[PDB]
């Protein structure tokens, strides 16, 4: 009777489900909320079998999408594909919710599912969107419908940056992928998402007031912005996975010998991979740095580990570093006391796993909103150092990579950057703890749900 039913909808891919699984976990930590996760999938193996609880409090339901292969081609952007899939899946999602015996009191969609909006309206459910990256990139998405109408040619071409009312100016090189090419599908789909945000009952952003106090304030009170929005923002971050016991973590038992904060963690996760030329440079610059590291490798994309590395790389670096194939327990490593640095694509979940541990960063942006994330982490916050030219524009050579490592790990500049990471970690802990802003922002989102019911 008293307890709420919240349904969170995840677009496909572990990279999208885990944040949604993290968000439901927080809602249910402090507020008597049954979480159902509608998990939009696409097709793979005999994994067509498409933590479901003893008390039925956190259930994952697979929602199998309909096949979009006939609406795409080999040159379609992954933003556009994601949007065409959710668009096409809409009836099956209409069907899932309609046949749920306990219908949800509130529906939260992730950022790639805002087209579910009519379904929530038809069924009369409170609607919300989960923006899982900066409030900055959120304010860009919303305002882009104004930049659309007042800029004539490409954005990538501009001489001066982009004035988001209230907010840091966005230098054209640092723009999100949908905005690289105005002729593309994804550009016109991005401008739409921006106008879809405002139709929800509120927006949740995985950030916290201290980290983005101007942006969040702009969102709430700017003259020019509040024309576009008219709904509240709930900064509830930084949300991310707790540390897990695992079975024989080869990397963790390595790190137990090393000295405190003396290892550089290098991983792009699943986000991405490097080309062969950029891979072998990173191999040298790590080798050259005379610096202890753990490196997660994905065979390269030019458009047995030894093969795609400099010859006898591992044989040489045997004493110094640790090379790891495919994947690692990233939250767990970043939580090791003996880790001091992190070269990362700046995916906002990886960033937040690093910050909440006071690990500073080498910002290596790759796609999506990562450039704009790597801009905040260096200019705005000073918790990271990026390469002089975004590694998407020009190769980053081993000499620069070498000095990057040495600065971060060895010098007093590195110690100050890490000092900033440890302060950010602290103000995140405050924001999450009882009475914090993110804590109260959640208790304020609950208040909104219980009000419309």
Numbering used by the authors: 3 to 52, 59 to 311, 327 to 476
What text does the study give?
NbUGT72AY1 is a promiscuous transferase that glycosylates bioactive hydroxycoumarins such as scopoletin and umbelliferone, as well as monolignols involved in lignin formation and various other small molecules. Five distinct GT protein folds have been identified that are capable of GT activity (termed GT-A to GT-E). NbUGT72AY1 adopts a GT-B fold comprised of two distinct N-terminal and C-terminal Rossmann-like domains (shown in cyan and brown in Fig. 2, respectively) of seven and six parallel β-sheets, respectively linked to α-helices, connected by a linker region and an interdomain cleft. The catalytic mechanism of inverting UGT such as NbUGT72AY1 is a direct displacement bimolecular nucleophilic substitution (SN2)-like reaction enabled by an enzymatic base catalyst.
To gain insight into the mechanism of NbUGT72AY1 catalysis, SI and UDPG glucohydrolase activity, we determined the crystal structure of the monomeric protein (apo) and complexes revealing the structural alterations induced by different ligands such as scopoletin (acceptor), UDP (product), UDP-2-deoxy-2-fluoro-D-glucose (UDP2FG, donor substitute), β-carotene (effector), retinol (effector) and combinations thereof. In addition to the apo-form (I), a protein structure was obtained, which crystallized in β-carotene-containing solution (II), differed from the apo-form, and lacked the electron density for the ligand. Asn372, Ser373, Glu376, Arg249, Ala351, and Trp350 frame their donor binding sites and in both structures, the indole ring of Trp350 points in the direction towards the uracil structure of UDP2FG and UDP, resulting in a π-stacking interaction. All other complexes that vary in their bound ligands have one (III, VI, VII, VIII, and IX) or two (I and II) disordered sequence parts (shown as red sticks in Fig. 2) located between Ile42-Leu59 and Ser309-Asp327. Upon substrate binding, the disordered Ile42-Leu59 sequence part in the apo-protein transforms into helix H2, which aligns parallel to helix H1 above the catalytic site. Starting with the apo-enzyme (I), two different conformational changes can occur after substrate binding depending on whether the acceptor (I → III) or donor (I → VII) is the first to interact with the protein. Thus, as the crystal structures indicate, random binding of substrates to the apo-enzyme is possible, but the products are formed only after ordered sequential binding of the substrates.
